[PDB]
Amino acid sequence: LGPAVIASIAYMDPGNFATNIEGGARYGYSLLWVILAANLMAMVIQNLSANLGIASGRNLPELIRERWPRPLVWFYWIQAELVAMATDLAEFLGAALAIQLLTGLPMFWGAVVTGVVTFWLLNLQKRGTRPLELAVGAFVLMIGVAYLVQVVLARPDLAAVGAGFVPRLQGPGSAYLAVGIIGATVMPHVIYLHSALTQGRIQTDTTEEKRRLVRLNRVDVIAAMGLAGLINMSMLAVAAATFHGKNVENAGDLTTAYQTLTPLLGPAASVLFAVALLASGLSSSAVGTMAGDVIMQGFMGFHIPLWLRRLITMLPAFIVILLGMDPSSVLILSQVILCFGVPFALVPLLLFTARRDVMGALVTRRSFTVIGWVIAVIIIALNGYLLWELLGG
Ligand SMILES: CCCCCCCC/C=C\CCCCCCCC(=O)OC[C@H](O)CO
Ligand SMILES: CCCCCCCC/C=C\CCCCCCCC(=O)OC[C@H](O)CO
Ligand SMILES: CCCCCCCC/C=C\CCCCCCCC(=O)OC[C@H](O)CO
Ligand SMILES: CCCCCCCC/C=C\CCCCCCCC(=O)OC[C@H](O)CO
Ligand SMILES: [Cl-]
Ligand SMILES: [Mn+2]
Ligand SMILES: [Mn+2]
């Protein structure tokens, strides 16, 4: 399958559902340009991260640990852990919410059931992961194809669709959801993990052999990112055609998101959406847990036991549940926090991929490094404009 698949399941976590449905319901098609821009940003960034592991032989947390001063390494590890908890917050609550959509249990008992499954998910082997990892990939992909079909059948207003690709914002609320979309697509925890997925996969330590893996990875990433982008744009366009302007109660909330596929799936739309949300949440929550321990091992050299890390990341989920906070609102919030961790992940990535002592003959072309720094400035400005609107005028 490759690393572009383990990536792709992270681009369809409950965080993507929350930002797509809410974005289409609240702002129509006006944010389609964000999904396209963020998806093209991820293509460049994930290619740089993948080329870092192939060329250097180490992941990004390892290179920071071995090259940068100890206090800066500590800071970069702390912020990476905050990114890891925010990542798991959306994925754990997304699965717990899907439990409520399927069984009607309260969110607390949905999290208890989610907690037992995730702890049983760590005690897994390749012969046991294969039927479960293939099944969740089937459920999520089929729902994705359902939105590609539904966007055609829903007859979206093409004039509004076309205008939505023109970069425009509509107050602070549109910036909040746009930053959430960027964080949901350009995920910092995948930035650190993608370099670890490609670091050891080499049959002959040769520049010729390394270039092939770079070329083969570039095709697999762009093909995977193109498909994920079409699905995300379809899901936002279908939610826009379904809720935007209709003045429906709790429009954009994940409790009613199944109504986007009701004209296609009929009565099965509720179960098929909740099953997909559950398979998307359980699989991503295990992927992020495996990524967080790899991130800490790379930064600190050591790691806490896997059961303790799984226990710590559950606490913000139960706190949010006990606080009565709306799950769909905190899934979007977590994606916004993730987008604030993107610039930190990009600075070492852009510096390391431009060095010959790190990359060897595979130094990034000067143009793609410039494009990477432009993406870093755009995201810093977007995060700055958002923090500006949230604190003052
Ligand atoms: C902004 C939104 C981005 C959209 C992203 C591209 C989505 C289209 C890709 C595949 C759909 C292929 C399956 C759609 C075919 C449906 C069959 C159909 O249209 O049937 C007509 C019906 O009979 C009444 O005339
Ligand atoms: C995710 C990577 C693969 C994604 C592949 C999906 C391709 C869709 C891309 C662009 C569609 C834009 C079509 C251009 C239509 C714009 C119409 C327009 O600009 O309208 C002008 C008017 O002035 C407005 O106010
Ligand atoms: C160094 C800077 C990076 C770290 C600091 C910036 C990271 C997040 C910034 C703004 C998001 C704050 C959004 C505030 C929205 C209101 C929160 C709230 O009221 O509770 C949550 C709500 O219930 C459900 O979203
Ligand atoms: C909004 C702006 C977003 C920008 C959208 C641009 C579209 C680029 C899409 C895919 C390129 C992915 C490949 C990136 C090239 C990395 C390979 C490289 O530069 O160096 C190769 C070297 O052999 C190994 O390090
Ligand atoms: Cl409209
Ligand atoms: Mn995601
Ligand atoms: Mn809700």
Swiss-Prot record:
The places in or outside the cell where this protein is found are: Cell membrane
Alphabetized UniProt keyword annotations: Cell membrane, Ion transport, Membrane, Symport, Transmembrane, Transmembrane helix, Transport
This entry's Gene Ontology molecular function terms read: cadmium ion transmembrane transporter activity; manganese ion transmembrane transporter activity; metal ion binding; symporter activity
Pfam families, alphabetically?
A: Nramp (PF01566)
Q: Specify whether Cytoplasm is a keyword of the entry.
A: no
Span of the signal peptide:
none
Output a single Gene Ontology CC term carried by this record: plasma membrane
**Membrane disposition:** Multi-pass membrane protein
Gene Ontology BP terms: iron ion transmembrane transport; manganese ion transport
Q: Spell out where the chain crosses the membrane.
A: 1-17, 28-48, 72-92, 101-121, 134-154, 173-193, 221-241, 261-281, 311-331, 332-352, 368-388
Q: What does this protein do?
A: H(+)-stimulated, divalent metal cation uptake system.
Similarity comment: family membership? Belongs to the NRAMP family.
User: What is the official name of this protein in its record?
Assistant: Divalent metal cation transporter MntH
Q: Which organism is it from?
A: Deinococcus radiodurans (strain ATCC 13939 / DSM 20539 / JCM 16871 / CCUG 27074 / LMG 4051 / NBRC 15346 / NCIMB 9279 / VKM B-1422 / R1)
Identify the gene encoding this protein: mntH
